[PDB]
């Protein structure tokens, strides 16, 4: 036995709340019956999570951001989770827009 329920459509959330931080990854193409926990125990396998922000509202599919403790991991996660299949539904993990800007030094004794 099986069946579907609940739909999705409309328009809103012109702009979401943003702050300033790193180790943040955006997860898209999520199911309607998704939970911040499932996503937690999901990316949790790649270490731990600091905080998860899920919007879930008129404006396409449900989206949320996962804040990892470390970047090296935050990437290792998206590096994989990006293209994962959950509940039969495909997920789209990718970093939020920001731009360029990556400097560094040689060492400097």
Swiss-Prot record:
Q: Which residues carry this modification: Omega-N-methylarginine?
A: 100
The alphabetized UniProt keywords are: Acetylation, Cytoplasm, Disease variant, Intellectual disability, Isopeptide bond, Methylation, mRNA processing, mRNA splicing, mRNA transport, Nucleus, Phosphoprotein, Repeat, RNA-binding, Spliceosome, Transport, Ubl conjugation
Per the record, residues carrying N-acetylserine are: 9
What does the PTM comment of the record read? Phosphorylated by CLK1, CLK2, CLK3 and CLK4. Phosphorylated by SRPK1 at multiple serines in its RS domain via a directional (C-terminal to N-terminal) and a dual-track mechanism incorporating both processive phosphorylation (in which the kinase stays attached to the substrate after each round of phosphorylation) and distributive phosphorylation steps (in which the kinase and substrate dissociate after each phosphorylation event). Asymmetrically dimethylated at arginines, probably by PRMT1, methylation promotes localization to nuclear speckles.
Q: Which residues carry this modification: Phosphoserine?
A: 9
Entry text on domains: The RRM 2 domain plays an important role in governing both the binding mode and the phosphorylation mechanism of the RS domain by SRPK1. RS domain and RRM 2 are uniquely positioned to initiate a highly directional (C-terminus to N-terminus) phosphorylation reaction in which the RS domain slides through an extended electronegative channel separating the docking groove of SRPK1 and the active site. RRM 2 binds toward the periphery of the active site and guides the directional phosphorylation mechanism. Both the RS domain and an RRM domain are required for nucleocytoplasmic shuttling.
What disorder is listed for this protein? Neurodevelopmental disorder with dysmorphic facies and behavioral abnormalities: An autosomal dominant disorder characterized by developmental delay, intellectual disability, speech delay, hypotonia, behavioral abnormalities, and non-specific dysmorphic facial features. Some patients have variable skeletal and cardiac anomalies.
Please identify the protein, giving its name as recorded.
Answer: Serine/arginine-rich splicing factor 1
């Amino acid at each position: 036995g099986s069946s579907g329920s609940s739909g999705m459509s409309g328009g809103g959330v012109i702009r979401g709340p943003a702050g300033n931080n790193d180790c943040r990854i955006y997860v898209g193409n999520l199911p309607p019956d998704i939970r911040t926990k499932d996503i937690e125990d999901v990316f949790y396998k790649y270490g731990a999570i600091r905080d998860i922000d899920l919007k879930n509202r008129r404006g396409g599919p449900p989206f949320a951001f996962v804040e990892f403790e470390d970047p090296r991991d935050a990437e290792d996660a998206v590096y994989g989770r990006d293209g994962y299949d959950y509940d039969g539904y495909r997920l789209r993990v990718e970093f939020p827009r920001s731009g360029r800007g990556t400097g560094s030094g040689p060492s400097s004794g």
